[PDB]
TrEMBL record:
A cellular component term, taken from the record's GO annotations: cytosol
Cross-referenced InterPro entries: Cof, HAD-like_sf, HAD-SF_hydro_IIB, HAD_sf
Natural source organism: Bacteroides thetaiotaomicron (strain ATCC 29148 / DSM 2079 / JCM 5827 / CCUG 10774 / NCTC 10582 / VPI-5482 / E50)
Keywords, ordered alphabetically: Hydrolase, Metal-binding
Name of the featured protein: Haloacid dehalogenase-like hydrolase
Signal peptide positions on this chain: none
Cited NCBIfam families: Cof-subfamily, HAD-SF-IIB
């Protein structure tokens, strides 16, 4: 039976329409916490911009975090796994974005920066997602840092164009306007493996919840994958069960369906 739950944040815990966590989600996570389920966040965001989970954090309901798509995982104050991107590939992405005239965010362990932020950053990251303004640094400076994740605001055509230049990185999206790039193998599936290794939980005892392309590997990898009802068709197809949309009690209904609560 299920022992560990892995939740994506945007479109799975937090509504893109209200920017809040549905009340029935908070009630379901309280009831699962008291039943002894372990509750984990699994997000493409780095810790520095997780600014929308205080309801669950102040209720002490989260047992650990998979951040940066699995490239930085921690339980309490303890880092259990982290990675960095090959410097050649950080430099190639900085050069490609600078040439194309698009912004890119560069995330280090303890710093986050943005290069040449433009309308796509202001429109999507700040006006819509409500992320705090990230400090600007030049592409040259960023190209030289030890980077755990890059977030280029590139289209799918542009991503296919830069691909040859980031030969070993993973790339995926939780929103259509930008993509997150991590080192080889660092996906939320790797995150689930590191968190259950720490707790002695088997893969056959996990359940994941997601709405986006960057959740597909953890929807297929967990023993039971739950897609949100408003997710695109390929995310639904990677799941074992499609629940109601997020703002129609999707999380609570899924957890009640399985008997988690
Ligand atoms: Mg999402």
């Amino acid at each position: 039976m299920t022992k560990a739950l892995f939740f994506d944040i945007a479109g799975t815990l937090v509504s893109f329409e209200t920017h809040r966590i549905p009340s029935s989600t908070i009630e379901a996570l309280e009831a699962a916490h008291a039943k002894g389920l372990k509750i984990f966040i699994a997000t493409g965001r780095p810790k520095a911009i997780i600014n929308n989970l205080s309801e669950l954090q102040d209720r002490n309901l989260i047992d650990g975090y998979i951040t940066m798509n699995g490239a930085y995982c921690f339980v309490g104050e303890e880092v259990i796994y982290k990675s960095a991107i090959p410097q050649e590939e950080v430099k190639a992405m900085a050069a490609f974005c600078e040439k194309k005239g698009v912004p890119c965010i560069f995330v280090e362990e303890h710093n986050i920066s943005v290069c040449q932020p433009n309308e796509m950053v202001k429109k999507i990251f700040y006006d819509f997602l409500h992320v705090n303004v990230i400090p600007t640094v030049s592409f040259e400076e960023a190209s030289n840092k030890e980077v755990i994740q890059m977030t280029p605001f590139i289209t799918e055509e542009e991503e296919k164009e830069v691909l040859p230049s980031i030969p070993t990185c993973e790339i995926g999206r939780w929103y259509p306007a930008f993509a997150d790039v991590t080192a080889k193998g660092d996906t939320k599936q790797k995150g689930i493996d590191e968190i259950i290794r720490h707790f002695g939980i088997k893969l056959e005892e996990t359940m994941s919840f997601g709405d986006g392309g960057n959740d597909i590997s953890m929807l297929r990898h967990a023993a039971i994958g739950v897609a949100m009802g408003q997710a695109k068709e390929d995310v639904k197809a990677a799941a074992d069960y499609v629940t109601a949309p997020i703002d129609e009690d999707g999380i609570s209904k899924a957890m009640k369906h399985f008997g988690i609560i």
